[PDB]
Design a protein around this ligand. Structure first.
Ligand SMILES: NS(=O)(=O)c1cc(C(=O)O)c(NCc2ccco2)cc1Cl
Ligand SMILES: NS(=O)(=O)c1cc(C(=O)O)c(NCc2ccco2)cc1Cl
Lengths: 829, 830
């Protein structure tokens, strides 16, 4: 069955080098009891990882054939990328262990057949060379043949285990010079002793052993897609762990009972009565032990690593059994690691490794990953000591396992996704303790490599927390990000005080985001990572086809706006005219705390050639903005496209107009600019005004250059400027005094935005003032980047729309990019 | 200014070990190794000081306290962790310095005639007495600290100057001990390391570290200066510099006077003749007897207070020792409990809220005092200062590494509240310092470092989710606020295409406090799959609208936070209900987080209600349909086996099925047992059965049963029909029964009247909408939630009264009933 397929592949993954190659040395180095405790602790850590993989696998939705795919969809890329990289590296380097064990077994065979190879130590590497160069071909070719031969090759392992357990119980005379005795309880008593260690310790042998009981993840998740892969696989993996554990415990007990720790291949040593001091622990026979305290026995349990091969019955078959085991485990590792690495490369988490996504094979099967794994595997083959290779393999596998356990616990604690484990056996604390014990056992063994590994993990944490990925949650798992944003906004709704932070938000009413790009850039400069600005577009069109064009325009403008990286959300509405859409955006747009409070408008430079009722619409838009207590911002900027950023604070307004330049300075674009504040005041009072204004300026900490308090206000500008203003308002001046009263009343009633004569004499001083400030701006702030000035206003209906726009024309007439502002009454800080 | 922080750092750093253990350190590690230890500890301290200066510069000019400075700069997590670790570290540092005082006193008593007990017990008793006297003084001692600090620094500098003068002054009587006049050969001999008693370089570094610690108290103890932003760095770092200089200005100097092995007796004096002199001692006059064989009385290895012996007129250096010990004791003992009280105040850790209260002449945490004094007096149990030091060294290293890594995390993550505003600061350098601190901790007392790592990991795990989800505790909203901002871009920047349909509903109920049952029920299936926007329209004068508008917003936000709903209360002002609903449905939401369906609690008791209200209510349905929203209504009874009856009768895009599926995936409705009713005429049952089965398999409902009814579209019982006719009787326009003129001017009098022609036209529709009521009554008498496809009609074709009466008849007297209709776009989208 499919569960039988997962179980057979997990049997194949777990049963590698240490089924027979090294387990003799472990059982002889510490003892039967200590070895069994090693098996138990390795089973504990492996089963904690199995529970974590069950928890991630049993998520509601199932997709993807890769292990990295499942770990990345189930939990965010923050841990997913690190787990993928670490496990890919570990699985790539496990090939080294498996093939070097293969080569050592071949060497053991060839020592008896061939008298001596030219370079025995390097013979392991020269054999590993042919093994890897043929294993790459086996991995890239005949995948279906390998899948069909899975069962055939694992039958070899089952036959080998049966062979050895058949051999161990029965006594035999064929292996008489060597250490072969059958289940003698004296052997158990004399081998249970922990005090067998030679240059190695308990945790060292645990570290060397650990590769045997690891690899469950590759069996579970490399397949990814099969019959019922979401729920039924984890039960197969837990049963896999149980079966492998029982096999290892039983085989360890049998080996410890059978073989003596030190056996010399000699016919002698058979003493009729050696009850005196019983130099041999098996004092009854003593066939094979003598003078091995001085000259150690060659064929002993701890001395001979492959004693189980020769001492078991029908020894030719067992060698082929290990051969199949190691080649199978190596090929599984060599096919599993590169695909994980390619999945990680396809994810844009690590652009430095982006070049590895090649897919040279027609049916995927990446080749560059194979080449990289080839290189690293051979480089690790360059070590001929398996007892030395094992600590690194255990190091990286333990790193990956601890990272998996901690990531699963993190998902359980911080519930951002739909992280609902369907396996009741999972518990967050159990996985946490598993991760802690994994980290501790990591520290204990080969501490320097452990510290290097923690440094690497912390470096990946740095790299991910800075460069955030955009592949997986961007496609088919945007729900994770949606829940992220929703939970963060709900958290935001928790805050209860608003007085501390004014925190400007800019609802920008540009016609379209692509239109007036300079305006968008400028407004984004002083509102970026300090507040959200919303590009509001009041769409015009028929009702029937409204929503479709809404959607298409929203998509197009959002793509354009993210291309020219902005922090803006395109919010379109439908309304009969601009004012209604503005009302919609002002009163309803925004959620909880992220609600716009300042209304940004581009100056209507084409008001002269446009219908005034739309300009009247514009001024009514200003007045509606003031009613809801918004801060009005107007930008006039020459669309046809380094010293200072001048400020012209005149009226108290609010704290917003002095706040705008500050945020401009910190963006590194206006960093090399100096704020030259201008504030009006009395001629007798500049010094007092200078100190009084410097107090507030220091409070705003905008590091003012100076405060050129001036008294040129309330002055007739000149003959020509008033002439120009008269020319500006001439097409709309209403000559009631010159014309008949009846016709003047008719013109007023049919059309109300005329500038009545009384309006001119009522507001003559205001017009003089506005022209005065215009000419002062021309004289002083001509060579400045971004002028800031308090926005002139008037009571609703007290001033006609035409004259109000005339004032805004006069003030911002010939200046560089200017930024008129009038905030609300409340102070910003 | 300078005197505010430079003096405090001078008097803090130069604690007890400079005056006793530094000479022993030079004994264990050679002059080169001693200087290497000095520079390494100085690098740690300088990196910590630079990080502290960056913290001070960031955020704002002034803060309530160092705890609050760190809290503003980063937030609750790192600030609370640093505060707790540093408070514990100062609590045990009090123990260190008082043990130093105790050992000096007991050594003096050894010099003195009488002895009370053996050495370890004398330390215990005298240290306890001094700790309780320090209790008496320290509880109220802020008035004289400003005057006392300068005098104590003067005394300490007098002691240091006395040592310097005594270094160049030899004397023949004291020459048997390690007392010589700046001889070069002894300096050469002392250059080489001599590590004895199984003491090693990093172990000596471990003991030494607390001597070069205490800079953080420069800003922690008090600000209150003319320029707190500028005064804190320029002092503290400066202090560190001279500290190291004085340390090295002592270190090599020590090696210039004192021999590594000496004995007091003058008898063992070599005769001036050609002798072997393996040791440099008999170079001058003194053979000794190779004191490595037998433990000698003095010689920088057995007389710790050797610096007291060298300086002429040793009472002054002894008094300097007293001054340094007491000064560092007061500094740390005032620093720690204030931090602990601040941690209680910020409410990051609810388990310790009982310790916030304080009282006295000025409110101070006497509880925090008593607990720190108790635990410190517990730590006095170990009377060996060499044993004491490594634990405090580990805590200081943990605190400094945590501070440096906190600065790095603020700088790297582009923290919204972070701004370096410092001339010479590099986040990479802070990382390097913190990392080296981590390895150094792991090197010394590996189990203790493991314990600290476990504690900090547990605190991090506690403060990641358990605290913030309920209440993070920080008073600076910005560090949260701005964060959410970018996440919204993360939601808007992702191209969702069309495969991102989720239930995002706004519940158009004016008063959230009223009708909480509907809010809880809709939040039940909107808890973790979408946003709930309890929109609220307000009608009133524009003059006072805004103020009361915000008042209502705040009050109802408090109410929704008091209960457990994940809902944003976004209210608007409008002329009437329809305009406000239009405002919400057109502009509410930002990015892709926009409402998609319009929950409307049924207008129960509409009988007494005016007809204009009902007209606007039905026009809300029509507007929602026009603007491509899903309409869901609910008739929960306001008084507020197990099965949820889903009557999928009209293909609405799967919403009618999706909603109960969301209900099931929750704790409350785990026992759901959905029963799916379908409508179909007489035909093969298998067609409908398998079609509905595969449709449910698509959306993963996992039906308990699928059942089909053929009794729809049949004539209902006569009593029910006449009951409905009497229901619609007050609004019925019997135009046929009455005269034509009356009906006419009544119709142009009120457009909502229902002509009998409407009843004739939709007689079969009313028959369906009442027969379905009878069927759901007899079949589904008991049911948790009855989710039913919502009837629809042409806009304006039927008078709103008749449409609303249809909706009322379909839910006449029922358990929780939930009518649903959606846009035909959620085709297996979820
Ligand atoms: N600043 S303006 O008067 O020239 C202006 C101008 C426009 C504009 O029409 O471009 C605009 N958008 C409304 C719109 C209609 C159709 C598409 O967008 C808003 C404004 Cl404030
Ligand atoms: N769900 S409902 O039709 O019965 C309804 C019910 C209410 C309601 O709570 O009365 C409501 N609030 C309007 C309001 C008036 C004053 C303040 O808010 C709106 C609606 Cl749509």
């Amino acid at each position: 069955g499919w569960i039988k397929g997962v179980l057979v592949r997990c049997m194949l993954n777990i049963w590698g080098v240490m089924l027979f190659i090294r387990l003799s040395w472990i059982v002889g180095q510490a003892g039967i009891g200590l070895s069994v405790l090693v098996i138990m602790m390795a089973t504990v850590v492996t089963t904690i990882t199995g529970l974590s993989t069950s928890a991630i696998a049993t998520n509601g939705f199932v997709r993807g054939g890769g292990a990295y795919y499942l770990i990345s969809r189930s939990l965010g890329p923050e841990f997913g990328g690190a787990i993928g990289l670490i496990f890919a590296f570990a699985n790539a380097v496990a090939v080294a262990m498996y093939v070097v064990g293969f080569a050592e077994t071949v060497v053991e065979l060839l020592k008896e057949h061939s008298i001596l190879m030219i370079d025995e130590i390097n013979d392991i590497r020269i054999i590993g060379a042919i093994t890897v160069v043929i294993l790459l071909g086996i991995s890239v070719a005949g995948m279906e043949w390998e899948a069909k031969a899975q069962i055939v090759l694992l039958v070899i392992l089952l036959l080998a285990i049966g062979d050895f357990v058949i051999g161990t119980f029965i006594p035999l005379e064929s292996k008489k010079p060597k250490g072969f005795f059958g289940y003698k309880s004296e052997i158990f008593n004399e081998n249970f002793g922990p005090d067998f260690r030679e240059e190695e310790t308990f945790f060292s042998v645990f570290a060397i052993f650990f590769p045997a009981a690891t690899g469950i993840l590759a069996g579970a998740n490399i397949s990814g897609d099969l019959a019922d892969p979401q729920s039924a696989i984890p039960k197969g993996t837990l049963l896999a762990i149980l079966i492998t554990t029982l096999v290892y415990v039983g085989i360890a007990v049998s080996v410890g009972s059978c073989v003596v720790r030190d056996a010399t291949g000699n016919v002698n040593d058979t003493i009729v009565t050696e009850l005196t001091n019983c130099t041999s622990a098996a004092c009854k026979l003593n066939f094979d032990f003598s003078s091995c305290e001085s000259s150690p026995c060659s064929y002993g349990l701890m001395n001979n690593f492959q004693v189980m091969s020769m001492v078991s019955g029908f020894t030719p078959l067992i060698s082929a059994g290990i051969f199949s085991a190691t080649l199978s485990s190596a090929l599984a590792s060599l096919v599993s690691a590169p695909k994980i690495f390619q999945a990680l490369c396809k994810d844009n988490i690590y652009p430095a490794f982006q070049m590895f996504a090649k897919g040279y094979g027609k049916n995927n099967e990446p080749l560059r990953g194979y080449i990289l794994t080839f290189l690293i595997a051979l480089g690790f083959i360059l070590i001929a000591e398996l007892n030395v290779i094992a600590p690194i393999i255990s190091n990286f596998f333990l790193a990956s396992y601890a990272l998996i356990n901690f990531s699963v616990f993190h998902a359980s604690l911080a519930k951002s996704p739909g992280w609902r484990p369907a396996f009741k056996y999972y518990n967050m604390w159990i996985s946490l303790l598993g991760a802690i014990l994994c980290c501790i056992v990591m520290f204990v063994i080969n501490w320097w490599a452990a510290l290097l590994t923690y440094v690497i993990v912390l470096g990946l944490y740095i790299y991910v927390t800075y460069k955030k990925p955009d592949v997986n949650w961007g496609s088919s798992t945007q729900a994770l990000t949606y829940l992220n944003a929703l939970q963060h906004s709900i958290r935001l709704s928790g805050v209860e005080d608003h007085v501390k932070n004014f925190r400007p938000q800019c609802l920008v009413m540009t016609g379209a985001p692509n239109s007036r790009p300079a305006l968008l850039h400028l407004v984004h400069d002083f509102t970026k990572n300090v507040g959200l600005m919303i590009c509001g577009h009041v769409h015009m069109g028929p009702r029937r086809q409204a929503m479709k064009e809404m959607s298409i325009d929203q998509a197009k403008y959002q793509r354009w706006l993210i291309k020219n990286k902005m922090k803006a959300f395109y919010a379109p509405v439908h309304a009969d005219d601009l004012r209604e859409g503005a009302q919609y955006l002002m009163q309803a747009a925004g959620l909880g705390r992220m609600k716009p409070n300042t209304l940004v408008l581009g100056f209507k430079k084409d008001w002269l050639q446009a219908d005034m009722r739309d300009v009247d619409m514009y001024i009514n838009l200003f007045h509606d903005a003031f009613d809801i207590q918004y801060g009005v911002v107007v930008i006039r900027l020459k669309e046809g496209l380094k010293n200072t950023i001048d400020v012209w604070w005149l009226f108290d307004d609010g704290g917003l107009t002095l706040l705008i330049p500050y945020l401009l300075t910190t963006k590194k674009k206006w960093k090399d600019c100096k704020i030259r504040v201008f504030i009006g005041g009395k001629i007798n009072r500049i010094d007092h005004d200078r100190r009084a204004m410097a107090t507030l300026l220091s409070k705003f900490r905008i590091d003012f250059s100076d405060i050129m308090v001036l008294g040129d206000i309330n002055t007739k500008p000149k003959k020509e400027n008033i002439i120009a203003f008269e020319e500006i308002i001439e097409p709309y001046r209403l000559h009631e005094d010159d014309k008949e009263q009846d016709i003047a009343d008719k013109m007023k009633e049919d059309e109300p935005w005329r500038i009545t004569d009384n309006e001119l004499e009522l507001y003559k001083t205001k017009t003089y003032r506005q022209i005065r400030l215009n000419e002062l701006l021309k004289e002083h702030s001509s060579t400045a980047n971004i002028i800031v000035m308090s926005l002139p206003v008037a009571r609703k209906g007290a001033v006609s729309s035409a004259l109000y726009m005339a004032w805004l024309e006069a003030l911002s007439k010939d200046l560089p990019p200017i930024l008129l502002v009038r905030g609300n009454h409340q102070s910003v800080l």
